[PDB]
Amino acid sequence: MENFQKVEKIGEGTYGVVYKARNKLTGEVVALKKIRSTAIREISLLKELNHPNIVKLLDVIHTENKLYLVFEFLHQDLKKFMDASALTGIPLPLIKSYLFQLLQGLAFCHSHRVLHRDLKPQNLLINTEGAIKLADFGLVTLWYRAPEILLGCKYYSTAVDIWSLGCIFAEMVTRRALFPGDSEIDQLFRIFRTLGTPDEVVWPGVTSMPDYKPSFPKWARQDFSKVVPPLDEDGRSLLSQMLHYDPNKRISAKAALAHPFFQDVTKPVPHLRL
Ligand SMILES: CC(C)c1cnc(Nc2ccc(S(N)(=O)=O)cc2)s1
Numbered sequence: 001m002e003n004f005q006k007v008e009k010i011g012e013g014t015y016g017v018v019y020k021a022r023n024k025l026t027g028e029v030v031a032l033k034k035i036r037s038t039a040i041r042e043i044s045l046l047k048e049l050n051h052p053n054i055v056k057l058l059d060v061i062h063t064e065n066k067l068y069l070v071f072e073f074l075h076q077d078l079k080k081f082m083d084a085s086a087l088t089g090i091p092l093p094l095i096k097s098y099l100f101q102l103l104q105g106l107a108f109c110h111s112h113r114v115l116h117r118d119l120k121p122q123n124l125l126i127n128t129e130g131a132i133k134l135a136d137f138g139l140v141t142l143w144y145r146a147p148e149i150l151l152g153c154k155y156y157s158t159a160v161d162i163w164s165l166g167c168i169f170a171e172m173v174t175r176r177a178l179f180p181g182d183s184e185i186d187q188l189f190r191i192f193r194t195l196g197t198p199d200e201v202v203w204p205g206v207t208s209m210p211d212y213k214p215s216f217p218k219w220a221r222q223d224f225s226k227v228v229p230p231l232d233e234d235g236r237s238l239l240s241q242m243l244h245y246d247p248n249k250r251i252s253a254k255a256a257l258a259h260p261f262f263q264d265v266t267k268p269v270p271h272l273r274l
Contacts, residue, residue: 001061001063001068003023003024003025004021004022004023004024004030004032004070005021005022005024006019006020006021006032007019007020007021007022007029008020010031011122013122013136014140015033015035016033016034016035016036017033017034018031018032018033018034019031019032019034020032020073029073030058030070030071030072030073031070031071031072031073032068032069032070032071033068033069033071033136034066034067034068035066035067035068035069036066039139040060040062042139043060043069043139044060046114046137047059047060049109049112049114051104051105051108051109052131052133053101053102053104053105053108053131053132053133053134054105054108054109054133054134055071055072055074055125055133055134055135055136056071056072057069057070057071058070058071058072071135071136074125074126074127074133075126075127075128075272075274076125076126076272076274077121077122077123077124077125077126077135078098078121078122078124078125078126078132078168079121079122081126081270081272082121082171082172082175084273085175086175089175090172091268093266093268094268094270095169095172095173096235096261096262096265096266097130097132097265097266097267097268098132098172099165099169100257100262100265101131101132102124102132102134102165103165103253103256103257104257105133105134106134106158106161106162106165106253107252107253107254107257109134110158110161110252110253110254114137115157115158115160115161116134116137116138116161116164117137117138117139117160117161118136118137118138119134119144119161119164119165119168120141120143120144120164120168121168121171123135123136124168126270126272128269128270128272129269130267130268130269130270142181142182142183142184142187143167143177143178143179143180143181143187144163144164144167144168145163145164145187146159146160146163146164146247147163147188147191147198147245148160148209148247150184150187150188150211151188151206151209151210151211151212152209152210152211152212153209153210156247157247158252158253159247159248159250159252160247161253162242162250162251162252162253162256163242163243163250165242166239166242166243167179169239169242170227170228170239173228173230173231173235174228174229174230178194178227179191179194189217192216192217192219193219194221194222194227195221195222195243195245196219196220196221196222197216197217197218197219198245202245202246203245203246204246206245224236224239224240234259234260234261235261237259237261238251238256238259238261241256241259242256
């Protein structure tokens, strides 16, 4: 840690504080995440998980019970790009590129039995060359949380990351968050008002989950034509399969890569002001 000089504070999360820093031996610019056993073991297995659409973990430094993670540095996150793109909107061929790349990253991690668990725009990082990357994997916001987690399930699957990415796809298209809940119950009821209250017809087993109550209000489903209007029929069809209630029926990352929405995918470059 005597090897690194802090340049500036980037920002914060639940776990820690992030700084831009410079390595005095290599000259290199990096990102440094500061946190105040089995944990060390599992974090260290991530040093071995390398893919062009995952932010690289360079090292783990454990000194005096403080833990520091050293990452490759990118110049902007997706939340800042969306805010700056607000009056014009992100062009459709760039939205489609970013979605395709993120599904490549997920298909890779899910084949090694690794889950992200906290996907949101602040955890997605971009560069000037047109790439987008998954960042800062989990071992605060409720807006991107899957319904099986909110209903109390303890042994949830890779399917929770597909739900989150669907919520993010809709947000890029409309320029507003899809389900902006402000407590656990408000998050759940916001999903139910849009997609309909789930029952045994659409999700076998749902009434037996730990936090399910027979007194939930009964709301009717709405058409996806009203949920994401500017999107074509191929894109609406894919989004609908990423937001199915039953996690066994929800589309996998590998299957989604084969959907007809990606028949004409390209790689455009963004306009960034750094
Ligand atoms: C910790 C790690 C995953 C990061 C790597 N590179 C980072 N860079 C970074 C740059 C700019 C912005 S922001 N909010 O757009 O000004 C946010 C993050 S964070």
